[PDB]
Nucleic acid binder design. Structure first.
Ligand SMILES: [Zn+2]
Lengths: 176, 42, 229
RNA sequence: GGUUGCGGCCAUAUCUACCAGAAAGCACCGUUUCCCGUCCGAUCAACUGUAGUUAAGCUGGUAAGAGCCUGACCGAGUAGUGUAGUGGGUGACCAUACGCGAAACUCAGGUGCUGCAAUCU
């Protein structure tokens, strides 16, 4: 009745920053081409990301030029998430939705989505990890009068699954 | 470090036992890919 | 033991602005004079609230009310001309000195161009004595280390909002009608905004007596939930 | 009877779960040409009070709710402790007598008053 759609004005499932990122195995012209591909895909200037520790398994030194990350908000992030779900064919089965309300996956090749492959360019894929939200969920991050957001206004994992199956008409929960 | 993210979304490694953040998809200690993050091929 | 070091506290709400001048006591702080931005419709502008010009108007009204309460309104008229130069009040020889005060911004960010600093500059133009610099002003340049002060004058005059309204009218139709919706109401044109601000400043300098409307037809019916037995 | 903004005396001064909130005020909330700021108007900085909302925030009440303080024959003068004698015990120690003496637990109470300035009844 009235309890069905009345909080939906003030408690609808909204999308926060998406923060698309890719990881390079080295630096240099490969990292420059990856940053150029990130700028061509997102439109914002990307951010280089340094190594926390020298791991040296595949070969790694700390605080080198390792990855590229950026935060996308608004309808551009929605269109990028729609393109990613179409690349995944609306199939995010089991461990994609988190308990706190995060979704995401990894795209193996930027050649398929977005722009086409070039021999000079790479085919290195990227990853999406989108945190959802509700209208008013940023009240805990303000400069003044910090407080809790409340458990009843938080996003549930089953609620996140229902939101995915509503917004994308997606397919979840495979047999394995 | 991120005010909009929590430690509940941090990914614990099944190979290196390190609770790595949401980005990147490599492990924080071992640089290996997370379990079933990309779509598995047929 | 009892010398009042007065502080001028400034607070900015999402739909109003509050200014106070107080000297604290043992039994709590004593607000000698205060102003709310809802009282700005009682002198001049009935629209365009919470602007930087509204901050300057609130500062001028608070300074004039404090001068009327202190009885030093006739001397120390303050910067009557609306000029972007920083003016420091000099104490009158043979008369009382300027009412020195501190500026309580609170937990606001100390960036140049904030509305609290604009209200402080309006209070300095009114004649209230507080030590401040022109670095945290609207027209100061961070890379040139100087204040151009004509842009600060236009922002004090509210010409920035007039230029924004003109650009929204010349760039869109529904957006200018939506953003300046109640500014389109009651005929606030892009012109005469500086004239309306000057008239409001002259009216605030003319009649500074803050008054309250009497209404004593109030009952004591309980509209809140009390404690169970 | 409520709200705002400054306050003072200062853990009886916390959390969680329901129910409510007339009116106003807060609060989310809408938009980035310009002041400012970042990878991102998310935060911070501007613009309007419109489009909406009490869903969160906030406040009040209710918990035989948990937690925290205060005391108490609350254990309890107790577990025991040390000493002495003309009981011994091969001794160790155990009683006798004296001189100190916990703790967990349990129970009872509370989970704070008030000023200034303004505004709704
Ligand atoms: Zn690992």
């Amino acid at each position: 009745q009235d309890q069905g759609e009345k909080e939906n004005p003030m408690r609808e499932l909204r999308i926060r920053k998406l923060c698309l990122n890719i990881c390079v195995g080295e630096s240099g012209d490969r990292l420059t081409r990856a940053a150029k591909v990130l700028e061509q895909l997102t439109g914002q200037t990307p951010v280089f990301s340094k190594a926390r520790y020298t791991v040296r398994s595949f070969g790694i030194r700390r605080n080198e030029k390792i990855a590229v990350h950026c935060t996308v908000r608004g309808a551009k992030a929605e269109e990028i998430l729609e393109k990613g779900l179409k690349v995944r064919e609306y199939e995010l089965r089991k461990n994609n939705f988190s308990d706190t309300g995060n979704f995401g996956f990894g795209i193996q090749e930027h050649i398929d989505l977005g722009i086409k492959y070039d021999p000079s360019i790479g085919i290195y894929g990227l990853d999406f990890y989108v945190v959802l939200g509700r209208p008013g969920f940023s009240i805990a991050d303000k400069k003044r009068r910090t407080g809790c957001i409340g458990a009843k206004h938080r996003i549930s994992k089953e609620e996140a699954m229902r939101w995915f199956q509503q917004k994308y008409d997606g397919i979840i929960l495979p047999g394995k | 470090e991120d005010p909009e993210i929590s430690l509940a979304d941090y990914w614990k490694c099944t190979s290196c036992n390190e609770m790595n953040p949401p980005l990147p998809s490599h492990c924080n200690r071992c640089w290996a890919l997370r379990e079933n993050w990309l779509p598995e091929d047929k | 033991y009892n010398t009042p070091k007065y502080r001028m506290i400034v607070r900015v709400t999402n739909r109003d602005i509050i200014c106070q001048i107080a000297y604290a006591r043992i039994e709590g702080d004593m607000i000698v004079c205060a102003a709310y931005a809802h009282e700005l419709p009682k002198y001049g502008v009935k629209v365009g609230l919470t602007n930087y010009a509204a901050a300057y108007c609130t500062g001028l009204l608070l300074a004039r009310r404090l001068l009327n309460r202190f009885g030093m309104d006739k001397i120390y008229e303050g910067q009557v001309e609306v000029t972007g130069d920083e003016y420091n009040v000099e104490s009158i020889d043979g008369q009382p000195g300027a009412f020195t005060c501190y500026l309580d911004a609170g937990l606001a960010r100390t960036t140049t161009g904030n509305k609290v600093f604009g209200a402080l500059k309006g209070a300095v133009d009114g004649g209230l004595s507080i030590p401040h610099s022109t670095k945290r002003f609207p027209g100061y340049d961070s890379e040139s280390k100087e204040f151009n002060a004509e842009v600060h004058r236009k922002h004090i005059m509210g010409q920035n909002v007039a230029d924004y309204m003109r650009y929204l009218m010349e760039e869109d139709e529904d957006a200018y009608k939506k953003q300046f919706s109640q500014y389109i109401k009651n005929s606030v044109t892009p012109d005469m905004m500086e004239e309306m601000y000057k008239k409001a400043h002259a009216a605030i300098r003319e009649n500074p007596v803050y008054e309250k409307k009497p209404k004593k037809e109030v009952k004591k019916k309980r509209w809140n939930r009390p404690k169970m037995s």
